[PDB]
Swiss-Prot record, chain A:
Disulfide bonds join C40-C84. This is Spike protein S2'. Glycans are attached at N32, N56, N92. It comes from Severe acute respiratory syndrome coronavirus 2 (2019-nCoV). Changing H59Y: In strain: Theta/P.3. Changing D76H: In strain: Alpha/B.1.1.7. Changing E50K: In strain: Theta/P.3. Subunit of the fusion protein that is processed upon entry into the host cell. Mediates fusion of the virion and cellular membranes by functioning as a class I viral fusion protein. Contains a viral fusion peptide that is unmasked after S2 cleavage. This cleavage can occur at the cell membrane by host TMPRSS2 or during endocytosis by host CSTL. In either case, this triggers an extensive and irreversible conformational change that leads to fusion of the viral envelope with the cellular cytoplasmic membrane, releasing viral genomic RNA into the host cell cytoplasm.
Curated annotation (Swiss-Prot), chain C:
Subunit of the fusion protein that is processed upon entry into the host cell. Mediates fusion of the virion and cellular membranes by functioning as a class I viral fusion protein. Contains a viral fusion peptide that is unmasked after S2 cleavage. This cleavage can occur at the cell membrane by host TMPRSS2 or during endocytosis by host CSTL. In either case, this triggers an extensive and irreversible conformational change that leads to fusion of the viral envelope with the cellular cytoplasmic membrane, releasing viral genomic RNA into the host cell cytoplasm. The chain holds residues 845 to 943 of 1273 of the full protein. This is Spike protein S2'. The lineage of its organism: Viruses, Riboviria, Orthornavirae, Pisuviricota, Pisoniviricetes.
Amino acid sequence: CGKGYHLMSFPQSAPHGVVFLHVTYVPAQEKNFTTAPAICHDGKAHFPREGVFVSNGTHWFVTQRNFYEPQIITTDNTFVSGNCDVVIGIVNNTVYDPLQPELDSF
Amino acid sequence: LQPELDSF
Amino acid sequence: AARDLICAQKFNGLTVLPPLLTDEMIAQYTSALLAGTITSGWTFGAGAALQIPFAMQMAYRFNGIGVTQNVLYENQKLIANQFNSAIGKIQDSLSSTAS
Ligand SMILES: *[C@@H]1O[C@H](CO)[C@@H](O[C@@H]2O[C@H](CO)[C@@H](O)[C@H](O)[C@H]2NC(C)=O)[C@H](O)[C@H]1NC(C)=O
Ligand SMILES: *[C@@H]1O[C@H](CO)[C@@H](O[C@@H]2O[C@H](CO)[C@@H](O)[C@H](O)[C@H]2NC(C)=O)[C@H](O)[C@H]1NC(C)=O
Ligand SMILES: *[C@@H]1O[C@H](CO)[C@@H](O)[C@H](O)[C@H]1NC(C)=O
Ligand SMILES: *[C@@H]1O[C@H](CO)[C@@H](O)[C@H](O)[C@H]1NC(C)=O
């Protein structure tokens, strides 16, 4: 349904056939980052449910794999499901609880 | 997920 | 030696045209597809190549069948050795068991 990430289509009447107009999502401008399979925090290997762990060089972000929308590392889009001494690629970082800045610091 | 608020 | 079968095919007008893509450039297509599958993954089918480590691509291909991506990240060596032994079984089947 179109070369790329397909969105929708338009049928159009044509002589002895049909013509589609596949509206298609296509990414254009790339950027290079530093990635890791998981995040060891307190002996727990956090790795995201939807996003990909990337860093620009100083801080780590959890943005999705189709559009750069960098978000802070929080236990809402990351699940542990293991330990951090098993996987090959891992880096040391911190994951902040969402409970903390609204009740614990508050 | 309570014990870090009162039991800590 | 003796007269060949292909010479008898050729001498009676049954000529065979070569393919446009020869075996070297077909192997170049295959190697480009393999390098884009390993290095870029599935993201080179939607424009340009977008680099990824192979463990991440195998994780994001486990996510597409309803399996969480902790399965390989606790068992990367086992899946890698299973893939190596399976492709060795394919190699031995191509070597001996022509079926
Ligand atoms: C990499 O990303 C970090 C995270 O945003 C950037 O750090 C920010 O820099 C701006 C500019 O001085 C500050 O206003 C922010 O407060 C910083 N964030 C934090 C959390 O301290 C950093 O500048 C980026 N580096 C590059 C080279 O792009
Ligand atoms: C899941 O199955 C795999 C094989 O499909 C098991 O891997 C083998 O385990 C035995 C244990 O004695 C080893 O001797 C073999 O060398 C392993 N095969 C390999 C590494 O290719 C695996 O142990 C099974 N999982 C569990 C939890 O038993
Ligand atoms: C990012 O940096 C690497 C480091 O050499 C470079 O090869 C690459 O072209 C850069 N850009 C992208 C989009 O990856
Ligand atoms: C990550 O941090 C832990 C403790 O904070 C340490 O034991 C471990 O060696 C560190 N690993 C790396 C690769 O720096």
